[PDB]
Amino acid sequence: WLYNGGPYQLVVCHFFLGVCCYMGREWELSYRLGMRPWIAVAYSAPVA
Amino acid sequence: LNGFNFNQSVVDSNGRVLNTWADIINRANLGMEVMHERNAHNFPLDLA
Amino acid sequence: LTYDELQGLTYLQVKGTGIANTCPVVEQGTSNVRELKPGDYKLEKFCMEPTSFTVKEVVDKGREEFVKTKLLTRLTISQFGMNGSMKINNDGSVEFREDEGLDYAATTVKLPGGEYVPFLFTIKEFDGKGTLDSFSGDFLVPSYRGSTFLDPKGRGGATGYDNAIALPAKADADEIQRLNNKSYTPGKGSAVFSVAKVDTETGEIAGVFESIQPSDTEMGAHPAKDIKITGLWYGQLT
Amino acid sequence: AYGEGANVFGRVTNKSGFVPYAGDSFALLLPSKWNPSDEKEVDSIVLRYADNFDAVNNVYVIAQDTDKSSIQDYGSPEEFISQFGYLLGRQAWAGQTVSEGGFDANKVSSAALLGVATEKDKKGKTYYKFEILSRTADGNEGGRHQLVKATVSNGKLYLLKVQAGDKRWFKGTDKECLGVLDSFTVV
Amino acid sequence: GRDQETTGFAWWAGNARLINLSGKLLGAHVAHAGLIVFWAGAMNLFEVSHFVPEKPMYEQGLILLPHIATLGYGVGPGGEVLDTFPYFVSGVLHLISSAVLGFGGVYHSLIGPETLEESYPFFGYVWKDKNKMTNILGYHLIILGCGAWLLVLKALYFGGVYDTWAPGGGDVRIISNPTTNAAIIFGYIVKSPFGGDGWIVSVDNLEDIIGGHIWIGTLCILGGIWHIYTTPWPWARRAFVWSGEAYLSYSLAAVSLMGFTACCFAWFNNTAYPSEFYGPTGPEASQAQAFTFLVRDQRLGANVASAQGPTGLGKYLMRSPTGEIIFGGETMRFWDFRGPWVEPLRGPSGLDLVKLKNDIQPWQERRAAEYMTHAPLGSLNSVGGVATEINAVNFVSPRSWLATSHFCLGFFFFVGHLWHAGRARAAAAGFEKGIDRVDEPVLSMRPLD
Amino acid sequence: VLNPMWRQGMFVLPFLTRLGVTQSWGGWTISGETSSNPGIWSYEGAAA
Amino acid sequence: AVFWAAFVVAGTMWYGSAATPIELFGPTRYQWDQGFFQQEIQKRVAQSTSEGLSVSEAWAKIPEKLAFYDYIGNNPAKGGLFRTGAMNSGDGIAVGWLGHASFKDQEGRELFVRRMPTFFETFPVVLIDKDGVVRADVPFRKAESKYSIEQVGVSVTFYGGELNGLTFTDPSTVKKYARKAQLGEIFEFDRSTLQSDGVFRSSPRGWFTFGHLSFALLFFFGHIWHGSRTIFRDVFAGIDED
Amino acid sequence: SQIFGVAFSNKRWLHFFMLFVPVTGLWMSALGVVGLALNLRAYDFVSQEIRAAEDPEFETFYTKNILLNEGIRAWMAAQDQPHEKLTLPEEVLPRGNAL
Amino acid sequence: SVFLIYPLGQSGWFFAPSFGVASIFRFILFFQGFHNWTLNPFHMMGVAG
Ligand code: CLA
Ligand code: CLA
Ligand code: CLA
Ligand code: CLA
Ligand code: CLA
Ligand code: CLA
Ligand SMILES: C=Cc1c(C)c2cc3nc(c4c5[nH]c(cc6nc(cc1[nH]2)C(C)=C6CC)c(C)c5C(=O)[C@@H]4C(=O)OC)[C@@H](CCC(=O)OC/C=C(\C)CCC[C@H](C)CCC[C@H](C)CCCC(C)C)[C@@H]3C
Numbered sequence A: 001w002l003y004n005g006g007p008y009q010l011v012v013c014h015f016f017l018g019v020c021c022y023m024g025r026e027w028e029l030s031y032r033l034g035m036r037p038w039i040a041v042a043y044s045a046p047v048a
Numbered sequence B: 001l002n003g004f005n006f007n008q009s010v011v012d013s014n015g016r017v018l019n020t021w022a023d024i025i026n027r028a029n030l031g032m033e034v035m036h037e038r039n040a041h042n043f044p045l046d047l048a
Numbered sequence C: 001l002t003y004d005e006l007q008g009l010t011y012l013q014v015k016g017t018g019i020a021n022t023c024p025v026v027e028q029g030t031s032n033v034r035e036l037k038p039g040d041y042k043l044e045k046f047c048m049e050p051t052s053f054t055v056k057e058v059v060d061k062g063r064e065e066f067v068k069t070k071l072l073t074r075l076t077i078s079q080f081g082m083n084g085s086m087k088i089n090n091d092g093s094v095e096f097r098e099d100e101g102l103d104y105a106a107t108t109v110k111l112p113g114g115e116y117v118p119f120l121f122t123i124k125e126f127d128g129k130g131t132l133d134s135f136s137g138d139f140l141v142p143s144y145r146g147s148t149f150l151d152p153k154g155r156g157g158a159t160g161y162d163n164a165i166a167l168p169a170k171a172d173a174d175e176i177q178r179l180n181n182k183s184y185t186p187g188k189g190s191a192v193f194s195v196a197k198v199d200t201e202t203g204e205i206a207g208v209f210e211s212i213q214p215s216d217t218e219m220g221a222h223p224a225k226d227i228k229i230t231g232l233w234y235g236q237l238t
Numbered sequence D: 001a002y003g004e005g006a007n008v009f010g011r012v013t014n015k016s017g018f019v020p021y022a023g024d025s026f027a028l029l030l031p032s033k034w035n036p037s038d039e040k041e042v043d044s045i046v047l048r049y050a051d052n053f054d055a056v057n058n059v060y061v062i063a064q065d066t067d068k069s070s071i072q073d074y075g076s077p078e079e080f081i082s083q084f085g086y087l088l089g090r091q092a093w094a095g096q097t098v099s100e101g102g103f104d105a106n107k108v109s110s111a112a113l114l115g116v117a118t119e120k121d122k123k124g125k126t127y128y129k130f131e132i133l134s135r136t137a138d139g140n141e142g143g144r145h146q147l148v149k150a151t152v153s154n155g156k157l158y159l160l161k162v163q164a165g166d167k168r169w170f171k172g173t174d175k176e177c178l179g180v181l182d183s184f185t186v187v
Numbered sequence E: 001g002r003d004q005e006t007t008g009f010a011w012w013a014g015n016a017r018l019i020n021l022s023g024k025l026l027g028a029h030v031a032h033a034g035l036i037v038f039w040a041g042a043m044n045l046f047e048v049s050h051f052v053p054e055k056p057m058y059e060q061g062l063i064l065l066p067h068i069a070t071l072g073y074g075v076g077p078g079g080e081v082l083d084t085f086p087y088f089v090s091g092v093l094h095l096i097s098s099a100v101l102g103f104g105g106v107y108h109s110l111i112g113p114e115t116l117e118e119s120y121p122f123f124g125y126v127w128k129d130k131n132k133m134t135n136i137l138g139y140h141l142i143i144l145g146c147g148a149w150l151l152v153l154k155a156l157y158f159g160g161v162y163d164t165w166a167p168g169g170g171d172v173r174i175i176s177n178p179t180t181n182a183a184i185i186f187g188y189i190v191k192s193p194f195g196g197d198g199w200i201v202s203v204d205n206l207e208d209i210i211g212g213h214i215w216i217g218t219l220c221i222l223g224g225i226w227h228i229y230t231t232p233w234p235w236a237r238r239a240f241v242w243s244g245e246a247y248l249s250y251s252l253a254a255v256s257l258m259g260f261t262a263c264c265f266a267w268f269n270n271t272a273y274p275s276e277f278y279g280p281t282g283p284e285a286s287q288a289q290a291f292t293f294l295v296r297d298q299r300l301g302a303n304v305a306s307a308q309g310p311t312g313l314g315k316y317l318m319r320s321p322t323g324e325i326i327f328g329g330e331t332m333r334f335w336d337f338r339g340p341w342v343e344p345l346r347g348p349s350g351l352d353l354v355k356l357k358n359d360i361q362p363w364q365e366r367r368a369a370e371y372m373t374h375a376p377l378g379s380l381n382s383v384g385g386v387a388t389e390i391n392a393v394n395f396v397s398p399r400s401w402l403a404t405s406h407f408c409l410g411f412f413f414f415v416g417h418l419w420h421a422g423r424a425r426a427a428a429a430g431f432e433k434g435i436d437r438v439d440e441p442v443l444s445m446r447p448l449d
Numbered sequence F: 001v002l003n004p005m006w007r008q009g010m011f012v013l014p015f016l017t018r019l020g021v022t023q024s025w026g027g028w029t030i031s032g033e034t035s036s037n038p039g040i041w042s043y044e045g046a047a048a
Numbered sequence G: 001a002v003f004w005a006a007f008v009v010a011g012t013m014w015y016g017s018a019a020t021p022i023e024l025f026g027p028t029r030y031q032w033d034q035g036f037f038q039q040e041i042q043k044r045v046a047q048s049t050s051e052g053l054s055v056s057e058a059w060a061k062i063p064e065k066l067a068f069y070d071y072i073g074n075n076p077a078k079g080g081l082f083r084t085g086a087m088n089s090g091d092g093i094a095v096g097w098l099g100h101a102s103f104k105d106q107e108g109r110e111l112f113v114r115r116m117p118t119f120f121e122t123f124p125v126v127l128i129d130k131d132g133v134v135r136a137d138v139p140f141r142k143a144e145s146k147y148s149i150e151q152v153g154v155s156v157t158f159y160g161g162e163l164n165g166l167t168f169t170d171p172s173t174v175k176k177y178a179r180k181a182q183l184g185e186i187f188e189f190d191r192s193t194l195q196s197d198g199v200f201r202s203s204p205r206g207w208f209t210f211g212h213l214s215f216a217l218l219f220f221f222g223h224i225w226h227g228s229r230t231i232f233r234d235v236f237a238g239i240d241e242d
Numbered sequence H: 001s002q003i004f005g006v007a008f009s010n011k012r013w014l015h016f017f018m019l020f021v022p023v024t025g026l027w028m029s030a031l032g033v034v035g036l037a038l039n040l041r042a043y044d045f046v047s048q049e050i051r052a053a054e055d056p057e058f059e060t061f062y063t064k065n066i067l068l069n070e071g072i073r074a075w076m077a078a079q080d081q082p083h084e085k086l087t088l089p090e091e092v093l094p095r096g097n098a099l
Numbered sequence I: 001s002v003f004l005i006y007p008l009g010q011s012g013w014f015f016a017p018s019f020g021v022a023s024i025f026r027f028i029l030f031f032q033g034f035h036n037w038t039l040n041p042f043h044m045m046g047v048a049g
C-alpha cells in the first residue's frame, strides 16, 4: 500500500474534504456570529 | 491547454529565424523536458 | 476456471477481477500423466503462474533457508503466451524448448525488516531435460534494467555521464564499480517442473513448477540474491 | 541604415520555405528556417545545415575523393551502403547486455533499411537514393531516418544525408526533408 | 429603469432592482434565452461557413457540427460528412427563434407589465408562494421530460443516432430494446467517480444511453405531476430557505456540478462524444501512439512480446496492476481506455497476442495514426503539440477547449452559488446589511472565545 | 548468541522479553527464529 | 557614510586593486574568466619555445604557484552559500603539479579541453581543435556517437611536472585526466586528512564581499529609517489630530 | 479566534504586520540575490549528493531537481552565451530514454 | 540587488535581467538552472513573506 502510493491518495482526499469543510464552516460561523459570509467567497480562491 | 507558444514565430523576409526570448524559453523547456521522468518515456511524443 | 470458459467471458466481467492473472486448470482426465500420446509436439498458450515468492537469506546464526516475503507490486506476477517444441518418447524422456513470448517479469518484493529485493522473474530459453514426472535445466536470466538506464546522477552502461559530476573531486576514488563501470552480466537460473493432470483429448497439461534465479545485482554493486519461486503452470499441445 | 521605405502593401516575398544555394560544383535547396552549423562532422565536409530548434534535423555534404570511375563501379545499393557505416555512428558501449532486447548481441542500435532507388539524371548518370531507419535501444526520438543521396562528379564523391527525428517525421518535417532530398542536383 | 435610492441597489446590482418584478424578470429571462439561441444559430452558421469537408471537422476547431452529427444528420458509414443541409436548417431555425425570443424579451423588458400578479394570476408569483412555484417547477420538469422523450423518439423512429462502437468504425443506427433494467441503469449513479469506474462518464453504448434517457424522461414527467399535484412538506420548509436568491443559488449549485461533470465527459467520454467528430481523447491519443509504434515495429520485424524496454518491464506490452495485458509505455496509466478500435484487439486476459500479431485492420491503424498526429495537445495560440513544439500544426482539440471552458463555467458558477447562498441565508435571517450597532450578538455572550 | 541484548546495552528490552514479548514487527525473533505473524503485541506494538 | 564605504570595499575586493593582493586574499573570478594566469603561462612557454628547447622540457621552468593560480578551484566564485569552511576541506590540499596536459588525436593535431565557465557547477568535457571546432567529447549517449575518445583515439601527454613525458592512451585514464583538465591545470590533492567532501568552497575575498554587500543593504534600510526618524522626531507617538 | 485559534486584538498592529510581511520578504529576497551575485548558492546538499553517489537506488525529488538543473544549464550555454561560442554537439547533451 | 548587484558581481550586464517580460522569464529560468534559486533559504524567506 505504501509502495503503490495509497497514503498519498488518502492524504490528498482528506485534505480536499477538510479544506472544503473548513471554508463552509467559515460561512457558518459568519452566519452564526453576525457577519457577511463572503469570507467563504474569498476562501474559494485558495480552495480553487 | 498550454501557455503562449511563440517559438520561431518571428522570421524575416529571407525566412531565417529571429530567435527570441520565447525561443530561449523553448530551448529551456527542452532542457527541462528531455529527462523529467528520465526512465518512464518509451515513446518520442509524450501524450500521457 | 478452465480454458473452455475462460474465453467464454468478455473483458468487462474480467477487468479488475484478477482473472487475467489466473491460469486455466484442467478439470477432466486423470493425473496419471503417462496417458499422453508420444511424439513431436508444438505447444501454444503455455502459461506460468507463481504461488509463493521467497528470498534466500544468510541467517545470522549460521542457518540458511528461504524466508517468506511481501509482494510490493500488485498482481503482475504471471507470464503468458509461451511457445516452443516438445518431443515425448516411449520411455518418457522429454526435452523442453522455449523461444519467445512475455518472457520477463520485473517485480519488487519486501523482505521482513524493510528490505526490498527487485528481480526479473524469467523462464526464457529454458531447456528442461528429464521425464514427464520431473525435468530440470538452465534458462537465460537478464539482469533487470537496460543498458541506457539512468541512476540519480545519470551514468550507467549505454547512456550516462560515466561519473558523478556533482562533485569535482569524486571522479577517481574507490567507486570504480559505482561510476566507471556498470555490470550487466546475465546470470543463469535453475528451474524444476512437474507435469500433472494431463487431458489427452485436447492435449492440455498442468502441474507445479519451481524457479531458482538470481535477482538484481543493481548494476555493479552489492551481490544479488537467489529467489525461490513456486507456482502452477498450464499448457496446450498444438 | 540607408534611406528606403518599409515593405508594406506589396504581398509576401517567400512562403515555400526553401532558399536555393550553390557551392563547389553543386547546388541544392536548403530550408529557409535552418541555420548552417560550424560543427564539421567528418573531416571532408564543405557545407552543413541544421535546424535551430533541434540540432537533430541536420544535413551535410561529403567531398571525399574517389579511386573508381563511378558509383556504378561500386555496384549494388546494398554493397554501396555496406561500406559507409561510419556515417550513422558507431556504438561506444562495449559491455555485453541482453537486458535491452530486440537487437543483436552487444548491440544497442540497428540500421533498418527502409528502401532503395535508382534515379536517373537528364542524360545517363544515376542518383542513388536510399532510406535507413536508425533506432536505438531506448528509441530516442523514436529512431532516426537516414535519407542518403550519392553521385559522382569529376572526382569528389558527393554524398548527402538529411538526418532528422522520427517525431519530426510525422510532425511536419518529412515534406521538407523530401524537398531537400530530391533537389540534391550535382553538375 | 430605477435609481439607487428607490430600490436600494446600485447599477452593478441593476437586475437586483427587478428581484421583486415578476414581469421584467420574465422579460429579462426571455431576452437572455433569445441571446443563448442567437449564439446557437450564430455558432452553427459561422462553423458551417468555415467548415471544410475534406479535413476532419475536429481539426478545424468545430464543436457544433459534432453535436449535430451525434444527433445523426448528414453523416454516413464511418463518420464522413455528406450533407450540411440539416446543419443549415438547425442553425436557421435557431436564428429565427432567436429573433422571436429577442422581440419578446425586449417587449417584456421595456413595456411589459411590471408585476404579473395583479393581471395574470397563473403567471403571478412571489418567492414564498410554495404551491404556485412548485406548479411552475412541475411545468418545467414536464417540459424537460418531453425534450428527453423527443431525443428518445429521434433515436427510435427518426433515423437513429451515430454509434462509434458500431462494427466497421461507427454508423448511424436505429436503437431497439433499450436498457430498462433498474440495477443496470442506476449502477452508473451509484458508481464511484475515480478511474476505472468514472461514475456516469463510463456509459459506453447507445442502448444504455437511450434506456437512461427513457428513465430520466419518465421520472421527470412523474416529478412534474408530483410537484403540480402536491405541496412541499413542513420538514422541507424547516430545512430550506425560501427566497428567490435561494432558488437562484440552488440552481447555480446544480449547474456547477453539471458543468464539472460535462467537463469530465468532454475529457474522457468517447461514446456520447465520438472522437471521429470531437477529436481523440488523451487516452485515445496515448494508446494510438503505443499501437502505431507496436505495429510499426511489427511490420519492420520485431517481436512485441519479447524485447523488454529500458525499465525491464516491457516497451510494448505490460501488465496492469489488476493483471490485464495492456500496452507499453507510460500509457499504462491510461490502461482503462475504451475506444471502439481496440476491443476486437482485446481478448480475455487483455490484449490477445495472436490477435495483435495476425489480425490487424487498416481502418484501425489509420484511425490511430491520425489521432496520434492530432492529439488533444496544443497552445491557446492554436500551436499544436507540447509547449516545446514549433508552430507547424494548427490544431487544438475541441475536447480540450470544451473541458477548459466548462471548468471555468462550473467553478465560477460554484462561487456564484455560494455567493447567492450566503446572501439567501443571511437575508432570510433578516441580516442583509450588517450588525445593528445596538443589538450586537458578540457583546451579549461570554468571553474567552 | 554472541551479541545478545545485554551486550548491546538494552534496558527495557529484557523487561519486555521477560514477561512474554519476544517477537517483533521487523520480522525476526530474539531467539533466532522468524516471526511468521507477531500479531499486535510486539515490541513496537507495546511501544505504540 | 559607512555603507558608502561598505559598497566601496565590496567593489574593490571583487574587482581587485592595489591594496587587494592576490597572494594574500586569493584570486578574482574575473582573472579566471579573462585567462590571466593561463595567458601568462602560455606566453612564458612561447618565449623559450620559439627559440629551441621545445615543449618536451621547460614546463618545469614554469613555477608551480602559477599553475596553482590557473585552477578553477582557485576561483573565489566556485563555492556555495553553505559550502562552509576552508577550501582544503572542500577539495583537499594540493601536493604537486602534474604538468599541462597536451591532447593529440590519431592524425596529429593538438586538441584542447574547454575551460569551465564560472557560472556552471558541472560542465561537459570536450576537445576542440586549433581552429575552434569541437573534435571530441565525453559521450553521454555513447550510441550512434562518432565523437567519442574510444573511437577517435586521443592520447594525453604531460611535461615538467610529477608526470613528465608520460603519454597515456587508455580511454578511461584519458577521460579522467580530461575531466581533471576541464577545471584548468592538473593537480593532485590529499583528501583523507581533512575529510574532503569534493565540492569547491569560496575564498575569503568572496565571503568578505558577500557579507559586506548584505551589510550595506541592511545599512541602507537603516539610513532610510533614521532619516525618517530625524525629520519626523515630533510625530512618533501620534499625529496632531487637528 | 474560533476559526483559526488566534486573532488580532489591535488595528494598529494588524496594519503594521500587513506592512511588515512584504517588506521583510522582499528584503530577504534581496539578500538572497546579493548572495547569488558572487556565485554563492544553496545548490548542493553535500550529504544527500554523497549518499546518492554511493547509492544507485536513492532517488529523491532534490536529486531530480539537481539533475534537471544541469540539464537546464547544458541547454542554456550554447544559445544563451554567444560570447562563449559553445558549439556543444547534440550527443553530449544529457537526455533520457525516448523523447 | 537584481539590476546592479548581480551584474556587478558576475561578469557583466549581459547576465543582468533585460527590461522585458519574456527577458525577465529568461533571467528567472537562468537563476532556476544556474543558481537553484528555489532551494535558496533567503528566497524561501521572501516567497513566504
Ligand atoms: C444565472 C446566474 C446569476 C444570476 C441570475 C445572478 C444575478 C445577480 N447577481 Mg450574480 N454571479 C453569478 C451568477 C448570477 N448572478 C456568478 C456565476 C458569479 C461569479 C462568482 C456572480 C457574482 C456576483 C457578484 C460579485 C455580484 C453579483 C450580483 C448579482 C445581482 C446584480 C447583478 C448585476 O446587475 O451586476 C452587473 C453584472 C455585470 C457587471 C457582469 C460582470 C462582468 C463579468 C465580470 C465579465 C465576465 C465575462 C468574461 C468573458 C467571463 C470569462 C470567464 C470564464 C467563463 C471563461 C443579481 C440579482 C451583485 C449582488 O450581490 O447584488 C445583490 C454582486 O455583487 N453576482
Ligand atoms: C443580458 C443581461 C441583462 C438583461 C436581460 C437585463 C434586463 C433588464 N435590465 Mg439590466 N443590467 C445588466 C444586464 C441585463 N439587464 C448589466 C450587466 C448591468 C450592469 C451594467 C445592468 C444594469 C441595470 C440597471 C441599473 C437597470 C437594469 C434594468 C433592466 C430591466 C429594464 C431596463 C429598461 O427597461 O430600461 C431601458 C434600457 C434601454 C433603453 C437600453 C437598451 C437599448 C436597447 C433596448 C438594446 C436592445 C437591443 C436588442 C438586440 C433589440 C432586439 C430587437 C428585437 C425587436 C428583435 C430589464 C428587464 C433596470 C431595472 O432595474 O428595471 C426596473 C435598471 O434600473 N439593468
Ligand atoms: C417564457 C415565455 C413567455 C411567457 C411565460 C409569456 C407570458 C405572457 N405574455 Mg408573452 N410573449 C413571449 C413569451 C412569453 N410570454 C414571446 C417570445 C413573445 C414574442 C412573440 C411574446 C409576446 C407577447 C405579447 C404581444 C403579449 C404577451 C402577453 C403575455 C401575458 C398574458 C397573455 C398571453 O399569455 O398571451 C398569449 C401567448 C401566446 C399567444 C403565445 C402562444 C402560447 C402557446 C401556449 C405557446 C406554446 C408553447 C410551445 C410549447 C412551444 C414552446 C417552444 C419552446 C422550445 C421555447 C403573459 C403573462 C400580453 C401582455 O403582455 O399583456 C399586456 C401581450 O399582449 N406576450
Ligand atoms: C430537478 C427537479 C426537481 C426538483 C428541483 C425537486 C425539488 C424538490 N422536491 Mg422533487 N422529485 C423530482 C424532481 C425534483 N424535485 C422527480 C423527478 C421526482 C420523481 C421521482 C420527485 C419526487 C419527489 C418527492 C416524492 C418529494 C419531492 C420533494 C421535493 C422538495 C424537497 C426535496 C428535498 O428535501 O431536497 C432533497 C432530498 C434529499 C436530499 C433526501 C432524498 C435522498 C435522495 C435524493 C434520494 C435519491 C436516491 C439516490 C440513490 C440518491 C443518490 C444521488 C446522488 C449520488 C447524487 C423540493 C423542493 C418532497 C416534497 O417536499 O414534496 C413536494 C417529496 O416528498 N420530490
Ligand atoms: C456564454 C457561455 C456558454 C457558451 C458559449 C456555451 C456553449 C455550449 N455549451 Mg454550455 N454551459 C454554460 C455556458 C455556455 N455554454 C454554463 C454556464 C453551463 C453550466 C456550467 C453550461 C453547461 C453545459 C452543458 C451541460 C452542456 C453544454 C454544452 C454546450 C455546447 C452545445 C450547446 C448545447 O447544445 O447545449 C444544450 C441545449 C439544450 C439543452 C437545448 C435543448 C436541445 C434539445 C433538447 C435538442 C433536441 C434535438 C432533437 C432530438 C432533434 C430531433 C427532432 C425530432 C426529429 C425528434 C456549446 C458549444 C453541451 C456540451 O457540449 O457538452 C459539454 C452540454 O451538454 N453547456
Ligand atoms: C494496564 C496497562 C499497562 C500494561 C498492560 C503495561 C505493560 C507493560 N509495561 Mg507499562 N506502564 C503503564 C501501564 C501498563 N503497562 C502505565 C500507566 C505506566 C506509567 C506509570 C507504565 C510505565 C511503564 C514503564 C516505565 C515500563 C513499562 C514496561 C511494561 C512492559 C513490561 C512490564 C514490566 O516491566 O514488568 C514488571 C512490572 C513490575 C515489576 C511492577 C511491580 C509492581 C510492584 C511490585 C507493586 C507492589 C506494591 C503494591 C501496591 C503492593 C500490593 C499489596 C498486595 C497485598 C495487594 C509491559 C509490556 C517496561 C518496558 O519494558 O517498557 C515497554 C518499562 O520499563 N511500563
Ligand atoms: C513587478 C511588480 C511591481 C510593480 C510593477 C510595482 C509598481 C509600483 N509600485 C509603486 C509603489 C510601491 N511599491 C511598494 C511595494 C511593493 N511593490 C511590489 C511590486 C510591484 N510594484 C511589491 C512586491 C511590494 C511589496 C514590498 C511600495 C511600498 C510602493 C510605493 O510607495 C509606490 C506606491 O504608491 O504604490 C502605488 C508605484 C510607483 C512606481 C513609480 O512611479 O516609481 C517612480 C520611478 C519610475 C517610474 C522609474 C522606474 C523605471 C524602471 C526602474 C526602469 C525601467 C523599467 C520599465 C519602465 C519597465 C520594465 C518592465 C520589464 C522589466 C518587464 C508603481 C506603480
Ligand SMILES: CC1=C(/C=C/C(C)=C/C=C/C(C)=C/C=C/C=C(C)/C=C/C=C(C)/C=C/C2=C(C)CCCC2(C)C)C(C)(C)CCC1
Pocket (backbone or CB within 6 Å): E185, E186, E188, E189, E200, E203, E208, E209, E210, E211, E212, E213, E215, E216, E239
Ligand atoms: C439520461 C441518461 C442516463 C440516466 C441518468 C440518471 C438516472 C440520472 C439521475 C439522477 C438522480 C435521480 C439525481 C437525483 C438527485 C438529487 C440531488 C443531487 C440532490 C440534492 C441535495 C443535497 C446535496 C442535500 C443537501 C442537504 C443535506 C445534506 C441534508 C439536509 C438538507 C440539505 C438540503 C441541507 C444514463 C447515464 C443511465 C445513460 C445515459 C443517459
Ligand code: OEX
Pocket (backbone or CB within 6 Å): B036, B037, B046, B047, B048, E330
Ligand atoms: O509524471 Mn511528471 O511529467 Ca506529466 O507528462 Mn506524462 O506525467 Mn510524467 O510524463 Mn510528462
Ligand SMILES: [Cl-]
Pocket (backbone or CB within 6 Å): B035, B036, B037, B038, H064
Ligand atoms: Cl522529474
Ligand SMILES: [Cl-]
Pocket (backbone or CB within 6 Å): B040, B041, B042, B043, B045, B046, B047, B048, E329, E330, E331
Ligand atoms: Cl510514454
